[PDB]
Amino acid sequence: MSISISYSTTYSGWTVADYLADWSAYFGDVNHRPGQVVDGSNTGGFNPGPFDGSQYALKSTASDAAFIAGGDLHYTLFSNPSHTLWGKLDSIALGDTLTGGASSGGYALDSQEVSFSNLGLDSPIAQGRDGTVHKVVYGLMSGDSSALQGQIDALLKAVDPSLSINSTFDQLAAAGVAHATPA
């Protein structure tokens, strides 16, 4: 199945690039970097976890923004290749106010703004930190949505070359890719 997008009507007239660049800035950078990793402050969590799951979720330390990565995901911690997120990335949900977790029937967003599903990304452990799944998610953690933008652009172009991250959500809805949700 092709990429499927869900968007709050708030973003009807925004391009996908407009939304993602502004979201990266609103979420900011959690500084999950050497000498700055703080368990429970800038690490996020897996469901079921601790280092594997169908979801990885992280709250901003700048705002109430949060994201949920969905698929079949694995983090290597100190194991070779160290600090690699790999596996299948099927979806990215962006918005505000993370709720739930493993004990609560899964992570959710109280204010889901935009979701991208059927991403079809599959990065093997052998690629380590060079894998697309790692670059997409570590980008979101660190205030840089360029890797996600590039993958969405390629998926949209493959549906029809008139579609791109410079398409508005309303243009993608007219093309049958995207679906409006309430504001």
Domain housing 47: 1-183
CA distance 30 to 36: 9
118-154 b/e (C-beta count within 10 Å ≥ 16 → b): ebebebeeeebeebbbbbbbbbbbbbebebbbebbbe
- DSSP assignment, residue 177? S
- In the chain, the number of structural domains is 1
Instruction: Judge whether 83 is annotated as a binding position.
Output: yes
**Is 84 within 8 Å of 95 (Cβ atoms)?**
no
| Backbone phi and psi for residue 160, each to the nearest 5 degrees, phi listed first | -165, 130
**Is 146 within 8 Å of 152 (Cβ atoms)?**
no
| Beta-bridge mates of residue 5 | 116, 178
Residue showing tokens 């079921």: 48
Burial (CB < 10 A; 0-12, 13-18, 19+), residue 50, is: exposed
Q: What secondary structure does DSSP assign to 31-100, as a single string?
A: --STT---TTTS--EEEE-SSEEEEEEEE-SSSSEEEEEEEEEEE-TTSSSSS-EEEEEEEEEEEEEEEE
Instruction: Judge whether 33 is annotated as a binding position.
Output: no
| Beta-bridge mates of residue 8 | 181
For this experimental structure, what is the resolution in angstroms? Answer: 1.4
Contacts of residue 131, defined as CB under 8 A and 6 or more positions apart, other chains included, come to 84, 85, 86, 123, 124
User: Token pair for residue 151?
Assistant: 């993958």
CA distance 162 to 127: 32
Instruction: Judge whether 129 is annotated as a binding position.
Output: yes
**Is 74 within 8 Å of 54 (Cβ atoms)?**
no
Instruction: Judge whether 71 is annotated as a binding position.
Output: no
CA distance 31 to 89: 22
- DSSP assignment, residue 176? T
User: Token pair for residue 4?
Assistant: 């499927």
CA distance 157 to 57: 28
**Is 60 within 8 Å of 28 (Cβ atoms)?**
yes
| Beta-bridge mates of residue 67 | 58, 94
CA distance 82 to 157: 34
